[PDB]
Amino acid sequence: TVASISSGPKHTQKVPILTANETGATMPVLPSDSIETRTTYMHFNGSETDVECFLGRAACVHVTEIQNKDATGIDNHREAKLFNDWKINLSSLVQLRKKLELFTYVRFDSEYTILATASQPDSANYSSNLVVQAMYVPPGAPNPKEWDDYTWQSASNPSVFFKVGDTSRFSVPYVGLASAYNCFYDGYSHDDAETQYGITVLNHMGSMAFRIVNEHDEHKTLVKIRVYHRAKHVEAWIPRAPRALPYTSIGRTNYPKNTEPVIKKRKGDIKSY
Amino acid sequence: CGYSDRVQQITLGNSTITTQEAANAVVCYAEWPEYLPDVDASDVNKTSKPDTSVCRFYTLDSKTWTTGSKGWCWKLPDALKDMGVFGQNMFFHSLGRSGYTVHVQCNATKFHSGCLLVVVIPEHQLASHEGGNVSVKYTFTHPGERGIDLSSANEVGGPVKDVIYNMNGTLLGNLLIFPHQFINLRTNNTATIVIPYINSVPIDSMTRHNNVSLMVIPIAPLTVPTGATPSLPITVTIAPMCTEFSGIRSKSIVPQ
Amino acid sequence: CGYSDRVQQITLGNSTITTQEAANAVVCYAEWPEYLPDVDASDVNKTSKPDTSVCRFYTLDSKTWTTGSKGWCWKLPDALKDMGVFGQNMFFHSLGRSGYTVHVQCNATKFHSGCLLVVVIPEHQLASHEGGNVSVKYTFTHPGERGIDLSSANEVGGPVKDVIYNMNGTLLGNLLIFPHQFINLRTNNTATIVIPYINSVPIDSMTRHNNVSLMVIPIAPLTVPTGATPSLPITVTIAPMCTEFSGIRSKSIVPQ
């Protein structure tokens, strides 16, 4: 593939350097149009700028603390952190969010990696060989209410069991109702004065509940679970203006009041280098 | 062989737009608007294609461009909800699908200076000014032919109106990634942007959801000659095309 | 080879009518409704053919048939002026042309006695009760889905309501020259009359002029069995077909 063609002096009524940007078109003007050029080759395919490479590597999306301890005399196992629930979203960790939000619609198969790591901050004699259950709870399915509820049975729900310290890895096909996920939704659930803007179930990947299936030991062991998401077979539409200001909420384009200027003010005038 | 690309005529239905200072029309993503094909269709109901009774130019109430104007934003199909038969069909049907020919008009003398950015943003999800997880209320996102004036004050439950941040936390300079055209008064008096139907679904509710958002933003401020009225009218004219409606039904009631 | 001519289904748009006691449908003057052809066309404007969004069954508010009911009259397209998208198009366009499938419904037991005359009268020019050269006022000739109840009292500027004289000075017995069907309760519970567009002009104003008039007239009075409610509901369901509209325009304002 040719990068630069050979081009000599130009004395022409065709002025490739003159155009009208008022047209909204970016004319493919080359160095060969402005200067005298030598022949060069690309030696480059552009493999790393493909959306599958750009959007298609693993990223931390969720981190959660859960405790394996005695469940006696506890009324809410979700809030005592015997299990925690995560409404699946890629909009909670901003670095990945910005990448996805370069586009309006994205259709990808997912590949999750869950890494559970234990810690016994208080007196412990040993490192317990805990097994975490990661349970996929799609909308409508009974969300677990107790750490050993009938829900965890997962007779129809997808579920993964893996040892703490070790990891789980499972693929998930594109689960969107539409032909693509909406990174942005300029609309409502219905025509209602108080209904939620932007937030829609078009992006309801589902939920993930995490428990340690082990019974309690005498010591408290804190398990920090980290969910990693990798997009595969990525298709992306409608490129957007990159995010400039920081986020405030999941699924909202909201930015903080009194936020700092993002355009990097010069030292000196417009003439400075 | 002589003629001109600045002199254009668009005839849709019984409506005709002419321009003598046109910049080359933009066709968003090089894709012309088309009826939904059977291979992409989900809804089984035979779609009403209303032809020339709706596929015509509706001119929107003019805006006044001053030296201190920040800009204006319209939502589609929202802006055309009160426009003739299109609006009626919009409210009588559960599902709607439409492309648009947007035509923005701002004429001035050869002594005038200023540049408008006319840009079409698909899924222009607005940001609340209250920050946090505060929602933008239905009434503010669906203003109608009035649109949103970005020079105005904020309202409780209303959107953020700092044109610099595109009302969404992105920078103004980058809007050029979206299908856009400038009205540079020295060059151009009319922008035109043909919008196809852009959605993740083949057809959608026209009332609850706005597919695209038209923004007209002064970049280079209006500089009028000495002794002139420090104002120019900006007139927006929109024509639906390849419009489809499905699931006819009792007229939908919306807020306000 | 067995089956039935009393069991009928008419599907128009998203609407479906079924009957199990039908008398053979009447097609006025053996002519099915059709779009206006180019050889009969006068108006140069391309006609809006609204398809299935208007070409569907609109059921009219039911009437109560008593022993003392004289009859009811509807004007078309007047009766459908408030019906969905058809009504909107009717008011938004200068010119309109439409055929109709009229479906009149009156069910009873095998113990009931009575006969309705369901008749379609083109150019049913009503007579004033005041005689002389007194005109019938717009409001009375354009009642809408309410229609004219002939059992009612006379009104100043209103029509004459003696069903015997067909409101026009002709005798009731002769209405059978017009495309008609009886609902004879012993035989039939449903009349159906497919009306083509009938006018001296290829297309006409739908607001100022009523092309046809539907009359439902009890001939043999309702005789209910002993101990029964001395009433039967009569429901009229009308579907526009081959509907054309031309000269889209600001919505017309009519009296009332």
Place this chain on the structure above:
Amino acid sequence: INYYKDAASTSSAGQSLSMDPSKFTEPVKDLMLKGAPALN
């Protein structure tokens, strides 16, 4: 060789060698040639 029944189980597709920047760079109705007057 794919070890699974599901398409979602497969690896990434690599690269779409098919580019066309024109849909973003030149989304114009009338054709504009480099060198020709943009407007006439």
Place this chain on the structure above:
Amino acid sequence: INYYKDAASTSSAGQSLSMDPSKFTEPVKDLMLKGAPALN
């Protein structure tokens, strides 16, 4: 490729593409056509 002698060792069969809802929906002696009077 099956790594075992036993049929029980194999993976699931995927999908039986052969449906026939008729045995449940239309378990009638005489044939009933959509449109024809159900009884005559």
Place this chain on the structure above:
RNA sequence: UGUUUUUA
């Protein structure tokens, strides 16, 4: 021919 490539 104020001509641009390719090959000895």
